[PDB]
Amino acid sequence: ETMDYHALNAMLNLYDKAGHIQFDKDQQAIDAFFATHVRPHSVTFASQHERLGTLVREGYYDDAVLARYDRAFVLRLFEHAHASGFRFQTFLGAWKFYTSYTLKTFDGKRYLEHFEDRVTMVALTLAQGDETLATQLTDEMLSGRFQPATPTFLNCGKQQRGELVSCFLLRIEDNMESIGRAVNSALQLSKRGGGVAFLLSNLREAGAPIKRIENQSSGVIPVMKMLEDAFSYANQLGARQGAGAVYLHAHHPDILRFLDTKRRIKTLSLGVVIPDITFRLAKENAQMALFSPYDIQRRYGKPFGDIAISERYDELIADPHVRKTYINARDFFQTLAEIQFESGYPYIMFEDTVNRANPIAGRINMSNLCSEILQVNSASRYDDNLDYTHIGHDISCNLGSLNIAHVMDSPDIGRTVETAIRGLTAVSDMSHIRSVPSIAAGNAASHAIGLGQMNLHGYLAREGIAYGSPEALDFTNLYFYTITWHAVHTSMRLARERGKTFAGFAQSRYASGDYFTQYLQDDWQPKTAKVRALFARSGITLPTREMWLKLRDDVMRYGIYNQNLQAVPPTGSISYINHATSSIHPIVAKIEIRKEGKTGRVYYPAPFMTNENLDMYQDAYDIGPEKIIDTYAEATRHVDQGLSLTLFFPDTATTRDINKAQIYAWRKGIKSLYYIRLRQL
Amino acid sequence: ETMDYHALNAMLNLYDKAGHIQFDKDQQAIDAFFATHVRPHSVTFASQHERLGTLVREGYYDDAVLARYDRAFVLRLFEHAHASGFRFQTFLGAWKFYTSYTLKTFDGKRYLEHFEDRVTMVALTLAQGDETLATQLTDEMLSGRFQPATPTFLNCGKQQRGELVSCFLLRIEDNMESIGRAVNSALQLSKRGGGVAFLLSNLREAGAPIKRIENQSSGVIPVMKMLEDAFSYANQLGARQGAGAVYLHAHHPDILRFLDTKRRIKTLSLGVVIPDITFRLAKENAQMALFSPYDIQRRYGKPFGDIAISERYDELIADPHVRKTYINARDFFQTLAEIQFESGYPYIMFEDTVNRANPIAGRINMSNLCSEILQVNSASRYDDNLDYTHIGHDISCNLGSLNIAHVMDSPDIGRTVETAIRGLTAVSDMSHIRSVPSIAAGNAASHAIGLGQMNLHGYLAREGIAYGSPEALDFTNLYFYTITWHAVHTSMRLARERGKTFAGFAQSRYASGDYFTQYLQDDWQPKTAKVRALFARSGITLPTREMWLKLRDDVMRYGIYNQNLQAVPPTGSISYINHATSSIHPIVAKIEIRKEGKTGRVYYPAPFMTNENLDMYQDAYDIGPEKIIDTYAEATRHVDQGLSLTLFFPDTATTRDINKAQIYAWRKGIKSLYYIRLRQL
């Protein structure tokens, strides 16, 4: 007799005379949802075998995927799938999946998939015919241990579908050709829903020459302006703005005009690269010198974006063949925070930290639209007709995440990590982005992937450890320690199985073993009793020196398949499906509210949370930056790419506050910073 | 003792108690210019031979051009050149050429060319080694009979230089690829100073689908928006806006949003194609039906831009598989004039008149930034990586003009026309625009050129005939009649010499002779005594039936080299150098004032004009549209492409006035209309 699941949902938004919540009311919502809406609008077939048939016949499922398997095997899988006992844990989780993920009939009126169907098809797709693999992926996803990126989760198997990968990073070179190409990539990538970031640092600055006639270039903005229109023009079906980003080196002469667009470029996001010296200068209240990329090129034969500024600052200041401009470092960071304060951006990439941690030959000069990807890239050369004469290497992202709790809840952690790695790797292998050759090239050369984490705050709460605490820090350090061991063990394996390794391996730190010197010392003993306890209870072995030493041999000898393994992005709405917390930070709220749906909003309580443990769920605001920054650093120690890191502040905070945080971060090893969020309603 | 040439110039701007002008004062200005400024800042070498040497050595002249000739021959030419007796006729003519055309040293401080040097190098360049040709071109240019387009005049021979051609017309196709390419062409062409127009009619309209999901396309504007930024970004060295245009069919569903950008797109110009039916509808106060290009394609397998609307209006109205929208034709033309009134644009291309007059297989769906070029074009197909899989045919302009007076002043009119044609043809042969394959293709396939006219009003005045008059109309009809005969005789010749013809010739009207039926009847007798007189006095024979009949045989048998011959654009500042009137219309003023120079302005009196014949120089305003429109029609009868036609109106004029004029034009055969100019200060 009460079947308004929204109402029921709404009830999570109520507190009783004792500041407690009717969590059950949310479970009632799930129940009414399935009963009043799903079950009734979901299609039931007489058998799976006819269902496939129909789905392929009418144009929904891609038969090419089913065809890599003996159909019996298929059926066996759907059955297992549906036999696993999967339930959604929350009304939003369900509602999200059916309103935006599950496959519907072409007219919208009926559902054709349920969570496990989708799971299955994903498993089938990535396993490319490998049945045991297919089974495992199925298992990993149904257990909650693994959660592929949205773009994969959503399209695998579908006949009419998106691409499986969808954030991309591109260079631009200081000539029109590159520029033209960039704008064209923007168009092609964004029409298909991709997020794309562009490096701008190589471009000659405002005022520089063209064809040896002085004061003629107009710098980056008018280029920013084009990319902007592109993204705005080429939305994705069912969207109005597209998403772009541009990164620019802080020491680039146009830095301030650049920052200035946000005090005008309304939809691209900005990101700024900052080397260590900049910090040095502002400390010692000094002047910042900006070098011309025009000159830099002619005198060094390389582009601004490819030299090491910190390492050649003085040199450069002294080379009179390099024009210099000066602004006040302290004011810089001031402008930086003022903007950040007004609008979240810009992101920040600690260039020196990054390159110093980079195990891969080359430098890293830019990042993605979520500031988590960090990888080398390389120039492309064109022909006057735009035809590539030299196809360089650009970057694209293959993502998925583990839900730490569920991982810890299963002793075979090595299987668990191997699978995800196997799956993301598949995503990479199946990927062939034709519209932008340099992307295709890159993928193909590197098989880079980015395995990421989520639900930390979820986990720690459940185990009664407070976010931020030494218990917490200790755990996050070792968890990531152990995840790294298995992932590289896995990539090593793959190289063996496939008998090849990523391009450049040889020049890498993996090749020489220097990549391990870190692990052959000691941290690795649980700084803490509780943490020691958790791993033990979980039946998981923390990798041991003998293990590392052995893996180091196997790597030096056999190599690894993927040039890059981990990356920790924010976990948008999949997190709700997976029932996990945004990534590894804490909980923007206890009962998160989203402005979605026919009622206006929908409410989402955190995992494992009950009236008897609320005190373990203090929100990000409440926890504040230090603790957050501290958690990410423990993680940053191991993750070869980077992690999206937001700082949440009270609306009373000041730019100095912001700046103190960024310094701390910087001082702490943090590779990069994402947006800064001032609390608002 | 008085050497301010500007002052002296200024004096043309003075009237005496009898409304007369000190024309001589302008000659004094020339004299002081050369004496106080040119001579002193121009470089004299001990001999020509060393001069060449130096100019090649230091990087100014291109030796590759000199190398096609025996150096003695060269020298002989410069000498002849300088021996011809050339003088500029006006202070602006000189001042223009030295401030913007002649070659200076790289630091700006000194001149290295004089009019005849430039003439010579042009002659050498186009003649490509042919000495008699080189001589003739020299002669034709020095006599004033010929005046190549600015881009050629200015760059031929130079080492550091522009392209020789510079207005281009491009299609776009209804898919992203084409769009991307368009924006890239915009960039590449405009960085080098080219004017470029785009067809937009094929693009699916605002609201149409994408990937079979309804209401999803955003039509042309956001595309207009990109092209706009492109042009604005890629100025030409020494310029801030670039120049673009977009054409769109009046019966395209986005027509009104389109017109609406100008009531927001600040720098592209607009142009509208209009078929006859539109006129029919508005007469009979009817509704205009707009057909979807999306549908049109699917149902007819061709793009909006390639079907004949007039011819299939009803059909289309009846095909229910073609979506239709309706707006009121009368209001259309109303909006058209209101905009025109506010801002000059849009240009107008009378599609049916044009295609009906078109001697060439195919249809004509767009025009250039000056509305004078009209030629067929064809789609290009791309690969997902932008690579052309099928290179279509797009259009570019090779222009030059004859100065009617000087032409008439020399009995060998056939030599005179043959040369120009030979020279423009050279421009075409030497042209290889790599950044846009479809342009290169087009040129190569067609060798289209556009020989044009100027100084009509100049001529008629001198011979005491009033602009507009039956004398005038009669002359312009026969002059163009005779120019056509010789140009086609010339192109015919070329095909023979070169032993090939333009692509498609066979499908042309030249091939079947229908191109001549017009000339084999009769008009061609001077309607007038004076006109008969002028040709006679000039020693020029008006082509005779036997002549046409003979040329028709030679053409049917041997073919012609160029697919298109004539085109009559406005003659911007070269006109001042050549000492002629903007094209064939009359004289925006008696003493034209330009806002140029260190004094703020510079004054330019019309050719042959003196206090004893002012009454023959009534300005365009004063003459008004009819007479103008009437002159162009006489011309439109013969010119295979089209002619830029501005109507000048009093600031009291009304949109109805404007609309009456456009109707007259339309009714009169006029192929197209350029901007409408309201008189302002």
Ligand SMILES: Nc1ccn([C@H]2C[C@H](O)[C@@H](COP(=O)(O)OP(=O)(O)OP(=O)(O)O)O2)c(=O)n1
């Ligand atoms: N009309 C132009 C031409 C170039 N640029 C900009 C874009 C590039 O960042 C930079 C270099 O363009 P190119 O390398 O194509 O320029 P060139 O190679 O012709 O000149 P240079 O050799 O001077 O670099 O100048 C511009 O804004 N407007």
Ligand SMILES: Nc1ccn([C@H]2C[C@H](O)[C@@H](COP(=O)(O)OP(=O)(O)OP(=O)(O)O)O2)c(=O)n1
């Ligand atoms: N994200 C997108 C995709 C397309 N278009 C526009 C530009 C083109 O005029 C038209 C056609 O683009 P494509 O042909 O590339 O579209 P498809 O071929 O994928 O779809 P269809 O086959 O539906 O035409 O749609 C757009 O505005 N935004």
Ligand SMILES: [Mg+2]
């Ligand atoms: Mg360059």
Ligand SMILES: [Mg+2]
């Ligand atoms: Mg299409």
